[PDB]
Amino acid sequence: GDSVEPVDTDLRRVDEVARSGGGRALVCRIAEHVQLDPDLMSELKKVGVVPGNEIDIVAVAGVNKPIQVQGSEGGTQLQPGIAHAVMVRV
Amino acid sequence: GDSVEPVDTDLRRVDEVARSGGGRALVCRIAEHVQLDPDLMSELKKVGVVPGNEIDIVAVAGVNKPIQVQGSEGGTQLQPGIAHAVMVRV
Amino acid sequence: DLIDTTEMYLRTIYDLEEEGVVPLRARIAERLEQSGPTVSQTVARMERDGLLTVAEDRHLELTKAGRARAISVMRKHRLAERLLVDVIGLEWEQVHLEACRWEHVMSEAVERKLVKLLGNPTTSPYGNPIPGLDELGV
Amino acid sequence: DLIDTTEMYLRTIYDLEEEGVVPLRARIAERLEQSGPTVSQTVARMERDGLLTVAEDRHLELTKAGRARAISVMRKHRLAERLLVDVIGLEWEQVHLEACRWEHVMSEAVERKLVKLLGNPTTSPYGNPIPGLDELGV
Amino acid sequence: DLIDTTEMYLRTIYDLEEEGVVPLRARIAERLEQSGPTVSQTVARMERDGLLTVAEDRHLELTKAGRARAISVMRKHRLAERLLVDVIGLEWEQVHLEACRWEHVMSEAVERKLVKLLGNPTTSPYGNPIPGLDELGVPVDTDLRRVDEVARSGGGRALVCRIAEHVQLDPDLMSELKKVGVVPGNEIDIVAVAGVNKPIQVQGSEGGTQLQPGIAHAVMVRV
Amino acid sequence: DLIDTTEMYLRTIYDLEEEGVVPLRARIAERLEQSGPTVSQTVARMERDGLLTVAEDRHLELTKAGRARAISVMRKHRLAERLLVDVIGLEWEQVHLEACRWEHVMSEAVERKLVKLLGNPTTSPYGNPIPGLDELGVPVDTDLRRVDEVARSGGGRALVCRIAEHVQLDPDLMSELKKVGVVPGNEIDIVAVAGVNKPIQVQGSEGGTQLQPGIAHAVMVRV
DNA sequence: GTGACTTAGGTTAGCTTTACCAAAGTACG
DNA sequence: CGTACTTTGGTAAAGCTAACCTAAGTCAC
Ligand SMILES: [Co+2]
Ligand SMILES: [Co+2]
Ligand SMILES: [Co+2]
Ligand SMILES: [Co+2]
Ligand SMILES: [Co+2]
Ligand SMILES: [Co+2]
Ligand SMILES: [Co+2]
Ligand SMILES: [Co+2]
């Protein structure tokens, strides 16, 4: 199942990329958990965290810290549970 | 089935004995339908229309006519439906 | 009121057979004091469960299972009546009305104890033969 | 509210597996906003019906039958999201909430029509792969 | 099964009004295939919540809140039927059964998008008017007569206009109607019958078929 | 099954009072083996008819009419148990089960005759006081202690006085108690236990056996 | 013109499972 | 001390069959 065990093994979670030391990444998947908050989804579309758009993931240190991301049209703070639920290609 | 088809083939219904020209008869069976009326059963015991007692059945003519009977301690008027439900040996 | 509807329909058909009356649904309505539609509906439920069949001339015929159950209820009835007269000493005129209810809650275990107690009775206090004594094994 | 309780427990376990989260009853309580006792009782019912099992470490494993049904719900969800975005033009942020309900009433007959209509989609508008397209026969 | 009991009780009452049948609980029992006691206990629950009232003759009246909710469900149903026929291309006989479930999960937001997409539709694929389009923010049919009444009045030729929700519930019948050509916008020859509760014969463009009294009563034509 | 649901709910509430257990609807559910919703809907039906009331702590209180009816059924039960033992001669373990049905069909008229026949009995064959004898027309029990509590307080020898209706429902258990000699008017040795929810060991005249916490709570003795 | 039964639309009682809740306690790390 | 789950006793909604009713109509003789 490409859903749970992706065929593209270079798919990584925004929170794991952030803790690894940030990087420029292509947005691929937004999990169903993230989609459940309409206000957040509006904010993700506005700044440009949507599938097919490149984003900059700012390096973070420690667990339970918000992950700062920069999109094509602004930046936004992702909660660990949200950042975990967004998958990217670096 | 002694209940529905009596082994003693000479058992007759009080109404049939009355219509055929009365006679002296031993009371044998009082059906469940008769027992349902307590006031009647009291009257049948008082006058002596009870199993093991001889009664006199008065001759009657026509259907739907009450059958007069004489017991050891008085007489009483049986409705056709009641008279039918009492069986005797002549 | 009836305690058990099924048992009272069966025994009512058994009564009508003993009295040589043609057991129609109309006769049950009269004797159990229920409306015609109620009796039709209940008889249909009892037909569905294979306790009786409605003939072409519309008289109700008990099946093997229906007759067996009817005999069981009547046997309990007439043993209860014997206990109620010969042992308990309830008044002669009231005993049937009591047995009308007791006939639905009596086990075959008690029936066999009552047979020993009453000295193998073959008739009710009202002279009606006790059926299905073979089926108890007594 | 959930439309179908069983299907939302199955898909919620499926979601947690996609997110690499350990599917405990605690996670279902949080995400479907139901009390712990409710979730334990419903999971127990779904275990009785053979849709999932509770392991020694207490994480919920979908059975063969449970995974088959979870895949069916999710496939309907992500085909609905595509119809809602690509064809109907519902706002990007409102589409999941709509698909959250549509996923419970969509036939496999409509799924096959949507596959033709949308030009064999392999992902949702949010980039999530559509599972169980094999099972439709497309 | 019903997905939403309340909405389907409201929509069954609406269907019966549209078909000129007296909405008794006995109708809801027959149509939704539920026990009398279940219908009474659910109608009692809806009476408590002020969605309907039970009159003295025991016919069901929709309240202002009830009629509003009934129209809302029925609007979703027929916009759903339009979407499935016009855009998705679901087979004619399968559409109502699908729409029967969809009418309970569609948002007013989606209805608005569907009105734009489908070009402000006024009728279902089965010729039934779509109500409550005013609530979203978006014809004299007194000349229509029922196939049963037309047949009982001597029959003749007629244009098919509406097939009721009642009739749409049977996929095999709807497949038969389509093949013989008893569909909205097609002509039919209704054969004359004298007896009530007798099946009416009708001749379409590609053959003819038998309609049961309750089916024929639920098909409306113009002669 | 219950023959009379109302009478069995009333008698279950009475049983729980005699055993010093708080009468909750949950107790009726597990004892009469019915669902929670059944018990609530039936207790609601009996509240309406003024046979009981549900308190704030949700414990069931019998009204004057409810308590009267409860006593009436419990009187018929224990007179029936006496008749089946003293006169008919039904086996000790089968008597309660029979009486469970008889208590619902017996008239006051028959009760009066049974009082005379049985010699004004005051206790059932299981040592339980027969109540409501005043209504027909006809001892300090504070020194009694429960076998579970006797064991939890150190155990010791005790005389069996009562076996509650609860215990009598299991014929196989009653057969065991009879063979071991744990019956009214027999001495037993209760072995000591420390914790609640622990099975109590008891030694009779012809052996010994294990009692579950709920069974041991329902057996009362004099030490 | 009855006596017998049916059609049509109810009712109450007495059951069920599903799917929600809160308070308080347990098991464990 | 926090997390996960259990125990205990509820709830409302949505279904069931059995067993009763009345009003009106049919049906054979
Ligand atoms: Co009798
Ligand atoms: Co009886
Ligand atoms: Co989604
Ligand atoms: Co959903
Ligand atoms: Co439709
Ligand atoms: Co529907
Ligand atoms: Co007892
Ligand atoms: Co009982």
Author numbering:
A (entry chain aa), B (entry chain dd): 141 to 230
C (entry chain A), D (entry chain D): 3 to 140
E (entry chain C), F (entry chain B): 3 to 140, 146 to 230
Provide excerpts from the study.
The first two putative IdeR binding sites in the cluster (C10S1 and C10S2) can be found in the intergenic region between genes SACE_2689 and SACE_2690. We also determined the crystal structure of the Co2+-activated complex of IdeR and C10S1 DNA. The structure of this complex does not display any significant differences compared to the complexes with the consensus sequence. However, the only notable differences regarding these distance-dependent interactions are the absence of the thymine methyl group in position 3 of the first repeat and the presence of a thymine methyl group in position 2 of the second repeat, as the distances between Pro39 and the fourth base pair are very similar regardless of the nature of the bases. Despite these differences, IdeR binds to the C10S1 sequence in the same way as to the consensus sequence.
The iron-dependent regulator IdeR is the main transcriptional regulator controlling iron homeostasis genes in Actinobacteria, including species from the Corynebacterium, Mycobacterium and Streptomyces genera, as well as the erythromycin-producing bacterium Saccharopolyspora erythraea. IdeR is an OCS from the DtxR (Diphtheria toxin repressor) family of transcriptional regulators which typically consist of three domains: an N-terminal DNA-binding winged helix-turn-helix (wHTH) motif, followed by a dimerization interface that contains most of the metal-binding residues, and a C-terminal SH3-like domain (21–23). The main function of IdeR is to repress the expression of iron uptake genes when the intracellular iron levels are sufficient. When iron levels are sufficient for iron ions to occupy the IdeR metal-binding sites, the regulator is activated and recognizes a highly conserved 19-bp sequence located in the promoter region of its target genes.
